[PDB]
Amino acid sequence: MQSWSAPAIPVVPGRGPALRLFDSADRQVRPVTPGPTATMYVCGITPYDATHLGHAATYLTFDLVHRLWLDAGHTVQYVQNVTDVDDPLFERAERDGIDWRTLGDRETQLFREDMAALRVLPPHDYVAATDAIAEVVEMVEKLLASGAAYIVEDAEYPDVYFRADATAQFGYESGYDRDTMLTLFAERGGDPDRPGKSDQLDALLWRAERPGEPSWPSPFGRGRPGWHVECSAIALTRIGTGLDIQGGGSDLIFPHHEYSAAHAESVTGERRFARHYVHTGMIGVLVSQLRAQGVDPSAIRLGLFSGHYREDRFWSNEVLDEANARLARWRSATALPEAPDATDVIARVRQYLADDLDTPKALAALDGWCTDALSYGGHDTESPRLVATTVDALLGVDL
Template identity: 60%
Template structure:
């Protein structure tokens, strides 16, 4: 599946700062060490039954910043993202709206691509739908069955395949949740703890046996379709190897999705840890209330752009808060971001000295290297824009424009 165009990126003068990120598993901020010259990054993609809202955008903008800092550090980036184009929410939405689930998925994927291009987000080199990876999932499920890490439930009608939480000795290392917390989130987030025939209520589905009215594919263990978590396990490791640099997504994916996707891969491939860093973004609220489909208070990227809002202002609105915090979106946030963007553009009419421009680039790098301190980075540009910058030098403006575009993805 094709992704979207690559935005412009300029190699900047001066000394890059090594990126440091917070790892959910270790609960610490640590330097990102890249083995070889290429960092592998896997970010969970959309289930295409609705278009890109601010919660989605905030997640992908975060990993776009990581991509940009890795490039600035001199690394290549192999970025992989999936699309869960076979899943219950997609089928339910299509049935509700009276449309074919494939057509619904295609329309929302196209809209997502357009939104990402508008927001100047770096695309994945591998953009893979679940339907494209069926054979890869079947292969991984078979590995789990062969080594005793998975089993078929004793159910003549629906012989689903489950992976055991006992298959890896370090299960739970990513989330650090108690069993009680795991049970709560498992039940809330697509798990089936009450399924009869499971060895443990927390065992996760890796192959769903065929049900009437659902798509299915043949496999050695019966016709069916992939479970949610193992889809990401297979897509990620088949392109990035059994260990890579960053796995990421929203904080609501910490458990069960990311815990299990890592566990499935580690059990199938006999590895200790799938990713060096598990990176998660905070949730976005609207006017003080959690943004959710059930509440009907989603803010959509394409509607903001259609209303005349600059995509760079949307980026700045998202970056006004730190990526790991629970943040709020409002008309005021967007207005402040638009005003900030205007101030920066006006300041570039009189960019001042190259010395101050070089200092600004160094400060931007310092903040972004410190676990993506975007509030500090934006404040540094504000300070530059409001200061007395001395006599104008043409290269100063060129450098500031290149830095804002390359490091922050903001077009001025």
């Protein structure tokens, strides 16, 4: 699929430390050590409604990772899916009297427009679930052949399941106990009470055809993919075994990322699907609404960057006001004909961003330089432009 248009990205002088990030599996901050091409899969939208600030905050976090990797001289392969076949889409399609395909199309396009407005770097491979059925079917074939998967003994609805015990390491990605898992599974799309499963935690790989649902052919019967195997199959076929980062919101830690990793490790025999599992905090308004109101997308960025990415945080008009004020101050200081030398502040910004994306400290360092420049001035004629270029390249903020 078409992704969206990228902004210009300047080259920033100097060099900083390599990125380190919290890994949900290891439950600690660890070096991210990619090859020449760094690879990241970030779970995309289910396009039944508008981009809210939550989704935005999540893709903005991964935009920072992308930008820092470019700054370090890597090329990037960023893959992101669209879950364009899903129960909530069918529900909304029925409610509003819009074809489910048309709905997914419309909302994906609005997402594109929101991302481009926010100057988020687009993925290199943007893949709709409906375009990846062959890859899912191929993966499910392999899982059935190994005995990792089975077909439930239900003549009417021969659903295909992945065994929760297929991998010895199952559970390492979330660290959650079985009781916690069952509780989350029941809420997050799982079917713990479905008759005939070997284990309540077995995950649907292929939902047998139901009357009224779209379907695709397969060697194990007509139906449609389960959720986790879509992302597993897209990641494996676009990126392969050398996956640096699997990303998304913290709600995906379990079941989704757990099963996606387990499907892949089962098929490939690799110990670990992704080198880092990176999860954003949950935000508690639509991007397009704010834009329609004349809100500067750079203020949206700064507002969402004012807290650390792993923190759950609330959006409010206070957060917006603070972001608008910060944006105005940075614009003032970087419009100065001369200002103090920027070598240290650029170095600090790189240090803080490399330390598990410490945006609050980076923002504070930049505030500091701006206040100093505006209060005492300086003799570097180049520093204001260089600070503006640095904020553009690394934070995606357009001063």
